Amino acid sequence: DSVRENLDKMISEAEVLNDMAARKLITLDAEQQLELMKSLVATQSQLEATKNLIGDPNATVADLQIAYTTLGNNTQALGNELIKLNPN
């Protein structure tokens, strides 16, 4: 069972959705652009925090665990937002 650092996995997943979202961004009208932006910025914010945290070789098994869970939840939500715009 993988170390608390299958964040590396969540981290690289978050990056990719964030990239995808920044592209769906220009192609959207205001109302929808803002919906996406709200979840994108949140994911971007959390990702950056998670990156800082894992830089601290100390931290804790909990703070890391929260980071993973939160970053995951944000990433998950961005996914649904992306699907909600272009089911494709």
Maximum distance among all Cα pairs of the chain, rounded to whole angstroms: 44
Distance, in Å, from the CA atom of 52 to the CA atom of 83, rounded to the nearest integer, reads 29
Resolution (A): 3.0
Tokens at 13, concatenated: 């997943």
Report yes or no: 67 and 53 within 8 Å, Cβ to Cβ: yes
- Give the domains, in start order, of the chain with CATH numbers: 1-88 (1.20.5.420)
Torsion-angle region of residue 21: left (phi > 0), alpha (psi -120 to 50) or beta? alpha
Distance, in Å, from the CA atom of 69 to the CA atom of 20, rounded to the nearest integer, reads 21
Tokens at 3, concatenated: 């170390």
Q: Which sign, positive or negative, has the C-alpha torsion 50, 55, 56, 58?
A: positive
Tally of CA atoms within 13 A in the half-sphere of 37 that contains its CB: 10
Distance, in Å, from the CA atom of 5 to the CA atom of 54, rounded to the nearest integer, reads 8
Place of tokens 């699907």: 83
**What is each CA distance from 37 to 29, 54, 62, 65, in whole angstroms?**
12, 26, 29, 26
Experimentally, how was this structure solved? X-ray
